[PDB]
Amino acid sequence: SKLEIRDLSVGYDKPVLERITMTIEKGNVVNFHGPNGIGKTTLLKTISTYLKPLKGEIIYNGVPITKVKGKIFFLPEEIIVPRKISVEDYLKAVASLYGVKVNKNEIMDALESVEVLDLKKKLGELSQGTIRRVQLASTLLVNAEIYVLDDPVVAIDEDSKHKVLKSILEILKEKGIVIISSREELSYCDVNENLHKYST
Ligand SMILES: [Cl-]
Ligand SMILES: [Cl-]
Ligand code: NA
């Protein structure tokens, strides 16, 4: 599976990033990096179909990306979850959006990958880092072919960030294309793209 990005400019009214041409392959994680404000979110929201490209095209296995929305999982940089739902019910619900039925054991395997133990606790009782860990576990349960994660380990303790991200990426890169954003290059990502190269 290949995602082809050709001559891409992204933005709302005016372009913030331009001339992006790359081939993204299943199994090779792409990290788009730079300081907050450079256009990471805008780029990732365009790849995810939420935003229309200003120029260029994004084609997945020969088909326009907008025709394969059901195959895309996008995790935004914000942490917004239903506060009265349990961890396990949230995971079941996210999977159900993709028509996937998960049992409590598949749920626990995903939570184990991010070192979260209590399935029963309501999300509103958890810390932001813990909630982000649960969101990352949810990515492991869907049948998506394209994973686009904006600031995936936001809010997670600095000394735990890399352990968690590596754990997630190791699973997701076997399932599909993975694109993430961050503030720095990552040794464990196959492709690092500094967005300064494309900045207007
Ligand atoms: Cl940004
Ligand atoms: Cl944490
Ligand atoms: Na609770």
Side-chain angles (χ1 to χ4, degrees), residues 3-13 15-18 20-24 27-44 46-54 56-91 93-100 102-108 110-120 123-156 158 160-165 167-169 171-172 175-184 186-200:
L3 184 70
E4 300 290 354
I5 295 174
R6 303 191 174 104
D7 301 304
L8 185 70
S9 286
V10 302
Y12 290 81
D13 275 2
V16 293
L17 296 167
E18 307 168 300
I20 302 169
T21 298
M22 45 194 304
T23 299
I24 302 181
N28 287 319
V29 183
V30 176
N31 173 38
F32 289 111
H33 63 93
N36 284 29
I38 199 165
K40 291 171 293 171
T41 300
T42 296
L43 174 56
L44 267 61
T46 302
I47 294 163
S48 299
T49 78
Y50 295 111
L51 202 61
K52 191 173 184 166
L54 289 176
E57 73 179 5
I58 303 164
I59 307 294
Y60 178 62
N61 291 338
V63 174
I65 188 79
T66 49
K67 287 194 107 82
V68 289
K69 284 173 197 202
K71 301 186 166 152
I72 302 167
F73 187 105
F74 171 63
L75 183 70
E77 64 188 333
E78 60 250 48
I79 300 169
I80 306 296
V81 298
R83 281 148 65 225
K84 301 183 192 169
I85 197 168
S86 66
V87 172
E88 61 178 354
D89 283 354
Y90 179 75
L91 254 54
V94 175
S96 185
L97 300 172
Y98 288 80
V100 180
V102 291
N103 63 57
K104 273 138 184 263
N105 279 302
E106 281 169 305
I107 285 174
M108 181 62 95
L111 290 169
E112 172 167 56
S113 295
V114 298
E115 297 193 283
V116 172
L117 179 63
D118 193 352
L119 267 70
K120 312 179 293 306
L123 298 179
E125 290 177 34
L126 306 177
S127 72
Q128 296 291 102
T130 299
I131 293 169
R132 189 56 160 204
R133 289 179 187 253
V134 170
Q135 296 190 299
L136 289 166
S138 81
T139 72
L140 306 181
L141 300 173
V142 302
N143 59 356
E145 291 167 37
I146 303 163
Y147 299 87
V148 183
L149 317 182
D150 196 11
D151 206 354
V153 288
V154 65
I156 293 171
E158 194 70 47
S160 305
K161 279 192 195 282
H162 295 300
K163 185 173 170 187
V164 169
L165 189 50
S167 283
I168 293 295
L169 292 179
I171 297 163
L172 292 184
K175 300 185 141 203
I177 281 167
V178 191
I179 294 151
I180 67 166
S181 74
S182 65
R183 275 154 223 97
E184 78 202 336
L186 295 170
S187 70
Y188 51 84
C189 290
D190 308 88
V191 175
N192 292 280
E193 280 289 328
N194 193 322
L195 291 184
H196 179 64
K197 293 203 275 163
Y198 306 111
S199 180
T200 289

